[PDB]
Amino acid sequence: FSKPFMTLGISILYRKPNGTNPGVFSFLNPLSPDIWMYVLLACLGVSC
Amino acid sequence: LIVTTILEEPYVLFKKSDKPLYGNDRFEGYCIDLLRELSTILGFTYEI
Amino acid sequence: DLAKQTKIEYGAVEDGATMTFFKKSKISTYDKMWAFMSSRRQSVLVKS
Amino acid sequence: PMGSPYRDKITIAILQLQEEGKLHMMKEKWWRGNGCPEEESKEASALG
Amino acid sequence: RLVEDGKYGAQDDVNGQWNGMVRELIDHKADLAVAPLAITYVREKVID
Numbered sequence: 001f002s003k004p005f006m007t008l009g010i011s012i013l014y015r016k017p018n019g020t021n022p023g024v025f026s027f028l029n030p031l032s033p034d035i036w037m038y039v040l041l042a043c044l045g046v047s048c
Numbered sequence: 049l050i051v052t053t054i055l056e057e058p059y060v061l062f063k064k065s066d067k068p069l070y071g072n073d074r075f076e077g078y079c080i081d082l083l084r085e086l087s088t089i090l091g092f093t094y095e096i
Numbered sequence: 097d098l099a100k101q102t103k104i105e106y107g108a109v110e111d112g113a114t115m116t117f118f119k120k121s122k123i124s125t126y127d128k129m130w131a132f133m134s135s136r137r138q139s140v141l142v143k144s
Numbered sequence: 145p146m147g148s149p150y151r152d153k154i155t156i157a158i159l160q161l162q163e164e165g166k167l168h169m170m171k172e173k174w175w176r177g178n179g180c181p182e183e184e185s186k187e188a189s190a191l192g
Numbered sequence: 193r194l195v196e197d198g199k200y201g202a203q204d205d206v207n208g209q210w211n212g213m214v215r216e217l218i219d220h221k222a223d224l225a226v227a228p229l230a231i232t233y234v235r236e237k238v239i240d
């Protein structure tokens with residue numbers, strides 16, 4: 001061989017995992033969808 | 049030096065290959081990989 | 097991480113330096129990969 | 145067996161392997177598997 | 193009979209001899225060594 005014109009290295013080629021976006025109703029996520037009902041049935045209940 | 053062993057994971061287990069092997073190359077795992085080191089040090093031949 | 101799993105298949109170009117690298121490797125991690133690649137050699141080692 | 149010239153030669157040979165760490169290198173080769181992820185992998189908790 | 197030279201055992205490589213309790217066993221001054229005498233490679237060659 002001659003003396004190298006480019007430096008190498010064995011590495012791993014693999015797909016990027018998809019960065020699924022936090023869609024614009026993202027702020028409803030910290031409570032479960034039944035708890036949002038249970039709060040809504042509370043404020044419709046306790047007010048009654 | 050007839051070595052009596054028994055098939056248990058991950059100690060002694062059969063080797064997975066496309067071609068079926070015959071003899072001592074059938075076996076892999078911990079204990080035969082130990083025994084290849086014991087055969088290197090003490091300098092003996094073994095038959096599993 | 098890539099050696100300690102069987103979910104993701106992995107190989108290299110056959111008759112190349114990377115196949116030659118793991119074939120004559122004595123690193124314990126890298127010998128596991130050639131122990132993997134030599135078994136399903138028809139499937140994971142692509143031609144180009 | 146009950147009285148052998150190979151008991152003391154292996155007792156030497158096992159003690160040689162553990163000061164070289166090779167009994168620890170062989171155990172990490174087989175007992176390390178998928179890594180078995182921990183219970184501290186929360187990543188999301190919608191309150192329910 | 194507690195050990196005279198207050199050590200456990202080590203081979204002074206130049207003039208190679210043992211000391212401590214290992215020298216008490218090789219010279220047959222002792223018969224036992226019931227003590228924190230750790231089983232190592234270089235000790236088990238000269239004592240049992």
Ligand SMILES: CCCCCCCC/C=C/CCCCCCCC(=O)O[C@@H](COC(=O)CCCCCCCCCCCCCCC)COP(=O)([O-])OCC[N+](C)(C)C
Nearest residue numbers: 020021022023024025026028029032033036037039040041
């Ligand atoms: C503390 C106050 C409590 C009030 C009680 C009422 C609570 C009653 C609520 C009950 C449940 C409402 C939320 C649903 C549960 C969320 C989970 C879900 O899967 O929805 C998802 C679908 O998107 C939707 O369909 C959300 C619902 C749309 C209406 C939002 C009204 C806001 C509440 C009115 C209150 C204002 C008035 C208040 C009073 C003046 C949202 O998630 P995403 O982002 O779409 O993820 C996918 C995105 N991607 C596709 C790209 C990947």
Ligand SMILES: CCCCCCCC/C=C/CCCCCCCC(=O)O[C@@H](COC(=O)CCCCCCCCCCCCCCC)COP(=O)([O-])OCC[N+](C)(C)C
Nearest residue numbers: 032033034035036037038040041042043044045046047048
């Ligand atoms: C006294 C006691 C009461 C008596 C009993 C009475 C009976 C009540 C019993 C009720 C039983 C519960 C049934 C509903 C279950 C829903 C949960 C769910 O998974 O669905 C979805 C809820 O996401 C929504 O779309 C919510 C609707 C819009 C939110 C706004 C509502 C409040 C507005 C403001 C309120 C003002 C407050 C004013 C205060 C003065 C979440 O999943 P998803 O992925 O989003 O699905 C999409 C569905 N879609 C395609 C059609 C959009």
Ligand SMILES: *[C@@H]1O[C@H](CO)[C@@H](O[C@@H]2O[C@H](CO)[C@@H](O)[C@H](O)[C@H]2NC(C)=O)[C@H](O)[C@H]1NC(C)=O
Nearest residue numbers: 014015016017018019020021022103104105187
């Ligand atoms: C990113 O990678 C792919 C691309 O969408 C997703 O997984 C595949 O999705 C296609 C449909 O687009 C399906 O037909 C395949 O069966 C899916 N394969 C697998 C292995 O899931 C993947 O879900 C995306 N997101 C992430 C977070 O990886």
Ligand SMILES: CC(C)CCC[C@@H](C)[C@H]1CC[C@H]2[C@@H]3CC=C4C[C@@H](O)CC[C@]4(C)[C@H]3CC[C@]12C
Nearest residue numbers: 034037038039040041042043044045046047192
């Ligand atoms: C005042 C009123 C209107 C509030 C809303 C209704 C209340 C009474 C109801 C609606 C759903 C109910 C919950 C449904 C499920 C569970 C899980 C169970 O393992 C314990 C009870 C518990 C936690 C219930 C407690 C009472 C509850 C919250």
Ligand SMILES: O=S1(=O)NCN(C2CC2)c2ccc(F)cc21
Nearest residue numbers: 001002003004005006007008009
């Ligand atoms: O000075 S060299 O002998 N010849 C020139 N090159 C490079 C083109 C990158 C490199 C690259 C890495 C080296 F280690 C040596 C050389």
Ligand SMILES: N[C@@H](CCC(=O)O)C(=O)O
Nearest residue numbers: 108109111112113114115
């Ligand atoms: N580029 C390598 C072959 C491909 C590989 O081994 O990854 C070589 O010059 O041999």
